[PDB]
């Protein structure tokens, strides 16, 4: 059946949909619907006992333990919070991309898996049979989970648009790109064996691996073009069990100069759409951001990048990040979840929010 509240799209990201309250979850989704944002990319992970304790929310505190440990009381189950988010998204017509582990250490990530299994390097996550088996166990538990607000397991839920393997996965110990390609083939194929209904994407930042005729604007952030991170986007996007390509865009973090943020991002977008079009798969700019304190006009940079994705036939453009009302120690001078990283947009009268509303109508 249908989602009561309900292709190319404006989307956004929000990482707290699996551990905050109903009021805060409803605020993000209602903002997304009010702004015309069709797709929200969210975290579906919370790995490791310290991380779960810190949020009083449990998903994967130890190997083979899913949800709240027997014997911990008064804790939230992150599956129940993700259930609420998915049921409210269905009501509000918002499609979700759910990411299954983090490359980074926030919410435990790959390093939490490596610690549980006694490895010594982040990239052991891609290599050690015992770690791969635990990731598969967690993904199988999640995809088969029956949503307590709908009755429908996630495998059969149409409000979920895609599973994503890993947020910003890198493998700096194999700059040929092959270790990541092999792991993405195994895990995208495994998810397709579990779930014949949903799209699968990788979730990588879109780095290239020294391709003829592709060089960075201005010679800056050359590592994003030359394969340093062990991401070879062309090889990833060619995997049969990957349905669309993802790329992210953060010139301020990547070493680009502020006077070059706009043009570097523009060339980056042009290069990714050109490659995706020749391969013949959809491409989504799934995270982009410029810090609020940048000495250039953020709204005009975001206008340029959205215009490019729209004019060149990209399938989606998703800003990092959308927040709504805050509570507790996460509330700012106006009652919103705070802008901790400089990227937050809320449904207000800021020029960025107005621009997003404008482009949500165009896409």
């Amino acid at each position: 059946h249908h989602s009561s509240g309900l292709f190319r799209f404006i989307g956004s990201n929000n990482y707290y949909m699996h551990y905050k309250s109903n009021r805060m979850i409803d605020s993000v989704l209602e903002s997304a619907r009010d702004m015309g944002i069709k797709v929200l990319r969210i975290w579906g992970f919370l790995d490791g006992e310290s991380y779960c304790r810190d949020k009083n929310t449990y998903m994967h505190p130890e190997p083979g333990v899913f949800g709240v440990p027997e014997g911990i009381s008064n804790a939230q189950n992150g599956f129940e919070r993700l259930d609420y988010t998915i049921a409210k998204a269905k009501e509000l017509g918002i499609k979700l991309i759910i990411v299954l582990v983090n490359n980074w250490d926030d919410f435990g990530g790959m390093n939490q898996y490596v610690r549980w299994f006694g490895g010594t390097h982040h990239d052991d996550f891609y290599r050690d049979e015992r770690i791969k088996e635990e990731y598969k166990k967690y993904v199988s538990f999640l995809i088969n989970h029956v949503n307590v607000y709908t009755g429908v397991p996630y495998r059969e839920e149409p409000t979920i648009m895609a599973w994503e393997l890993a947020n910003e996965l890198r493998c700096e110990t194999d700059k040929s790109g092959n270790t990541l390609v092999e792991w993405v083939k195994e895990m995208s194929s495994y998810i397709k064996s579990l779930d014949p209904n949903h799209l699968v994407a990788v979730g990588d930042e879109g780095f290239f691996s020294n391709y003829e005729g592709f060089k960075p604007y201005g010679g800056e952030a050359e590592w994003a073009y030359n394969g340093w991170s062990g991401v070879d986007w062309k090889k990833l996007l060619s995997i049969e069990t990957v349905d669309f390509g993802t790329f992210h865009l953060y010139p301020s973090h990547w070493g680009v100069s502020p006077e070059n943020y706009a043009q570097w991002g523009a060339k980056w977008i042009e290069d990714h759409i050109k490659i995706a079009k020749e391969i013949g798969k959809p491409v989504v700019l799934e995270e982009y951001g410029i810090p609020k304190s940048a000495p250039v006009n953020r709204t005009a940079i975001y206008r340029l990048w959205n215009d490019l994705v729209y004019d060149l036939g990209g399938d989606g453009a998703m800003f990092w990040m959308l927040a709504g009302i805050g509570e507790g120690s996460d509330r700012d001078e106006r009652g919103y979840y705070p802008d901790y990283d400089g990227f937050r947009i809320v449904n207000d009268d800021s020029p960025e929010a107005e621009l997003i509303r404008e482009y949500a109508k165009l896409f």
Side-chain angles (χ1 to χ4, degrees):
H1 291 147
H2 65 219
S3 295
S4 67
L6 252 186
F7 98 112
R8 306 179 79 193
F9 55 94
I10 291 303
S12 193
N13 289 265
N14 180 288
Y15 62 80
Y16 62 64
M17 303 301 284
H18 62 318
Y19 65 94
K20 289 295 200 190
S21 65
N22 290 0
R23 180 170 166 274
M24 290 178 68
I25 282 164
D26 286 356
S27 181
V28 171
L29 295 167
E30 291 162 12
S31 291
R33 179 179 176 90
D34 191 51
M35 296 174 78
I37 295 164
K38 294 182 198 176
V39 178
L40 189 70
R41 176 167 176 269
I42 69 177
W43 288 175
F45 46 82
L46 227 176
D47 290 308
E49 167 226 287
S50 67
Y51 294 95
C52 289
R53 185 169 239 198
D54 180 67
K55 300 313 192 282
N56 195 35
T57 305
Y58 291 76
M59 297 184 86
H60 187 198
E62 300 287 350
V65 180
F66 306 115
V68 178
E70 173 184 40
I72 293 310
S73 296
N74 299 109
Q76 300 188 140
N77 174 355
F79 292 95
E80 178 278 331
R81 296 280 78 211
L82 189 47
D83 284 348
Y84 183 86
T85 286
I86 286 163
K88 288 298 303 191
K90 193 179 211 172
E91 172 189 336
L92 293 165
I94 303 305
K95 297 278 185 164
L96 297 175
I97 297 174
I98 295 176
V99 187
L100 294 166
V101 66
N102 200 355
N103 190 68
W104 310 118
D105 292 357
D106 308 280
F107 309 99
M110 292 174 188
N111 278 336
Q112 173 67 69
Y113 280 75
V114 172
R115 291 189 307 268
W116 277 335
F117 293 97
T120 58
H121 193 283
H122 172 272
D123 296 352
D124 289 350
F125 176 87
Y126 303 114
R127 300 190 169 109
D128 294 353
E129 284 301 333
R130 307 157 289 146
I131 297 178
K132 290 173 36 193
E133 282 308 311
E134 186 65 22
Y135 174 83
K136 287 178 186 179
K137 286 188 190 166
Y138 175 69
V139 171
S140 184
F141 180 95
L142 182 154
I143 291 183
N144 288 305
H145 171 76
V146 169
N147 182 324
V148 300
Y149 293 104
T150 71
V152 177
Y154 291 179
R155 190 180 66 247
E156 293 173 355
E157 176 52 62
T159 212
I160 297 168
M161 178 181 156
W163 304 117
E164 186 153 275
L165 299 183
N167 182 47
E168 300 193 342
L169 81 180
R170 298 187 181 182
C171 188
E172 286 175 351
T173 59
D174 180 6
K175 301 191 189 311
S176 72
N178 291 323
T179 291
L180 279 186
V181 164
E182 294 153 5
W183 182 89
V184 172
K185 286 177 179 185
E186 172 169 352
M187 300 304 186
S188 66
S189 181
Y190 177 72
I191 293 175
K192 290 298 197 171
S193 81
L194 294 169
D195 180 339
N197 307 122
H198 285 112
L199 300 172
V200 178
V202 179
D204 66 287
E205 297 157 279
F207 303 129
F208 298 156
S209 189
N210 201 357
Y211 305 155
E212 182 152 357
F214 291 88
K215 297 181 162 163
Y217 183 81
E220 292 183 324
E222 185 144 59
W223 64 273
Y225 272 76
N226 287 345
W228 190 267
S229 302
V231 175
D232 181 335
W233 196 61
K234 273 202 301 194
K235 292 207 303 238
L236 292 174
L237 191 47
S238 291
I239 288 170
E240 198 174 354
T241 41
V242 169
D243 289 305
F244 60 92
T246 55
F247 73 116
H248 299 192
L249 171 51
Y250 289 99
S252 67
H253 292 170
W254 295 346
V256 182
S257 292
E259 60 173 11
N260 293 331
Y261 288 168
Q263 293 167 102
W264 195 100
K267 185 174 193 286
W268 187 240
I269 288 164
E270 291 164 354
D271 282 353
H272 281 79
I273 297 171
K274 180 172 165 215
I275 290 164
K277 289 285 178 189
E278 187 158 23
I279 289 172
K281 287 181 187 178
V283 55
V284 177
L285 173 58
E286 84 172 352
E287 292 189 23
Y288 62 89
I290 292 290
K292 193 178 174 214
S293 75
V296 270
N297 186 321
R298 175 161 74 171
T299 302
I301 294 170
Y302 282 9
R303 169 175 304 274
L304 176 67
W305 292 347
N306 280 279
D307 263 330
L308 284 176
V309 173
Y310 181 68
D311 287 348
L312 301 166
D315 308 274
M318 313 180 66
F319 60 99
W320 178 277
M321 54 88 62
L322 175 69
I325 207 66
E327 286 177 349
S329 58
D330 287 315
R331 181 174 67 177
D332 73 6
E333 58 276 23
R334 288 161 73 211
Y336 291 114
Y337 182 81
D339 187 6
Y340 291 124
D341 44 16
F343 292 120
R344 177 199 73 176
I345 302 186
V346 299
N347 187 18
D348 69 0
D349 292 324
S350 72
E352 293 89 340
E354 298 175 340
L355 177 80
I356 293 305
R357 288 185 207 106
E358 181 195 342
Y359 272 80
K361 291 178 199 167
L362 183 62
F363 275 79

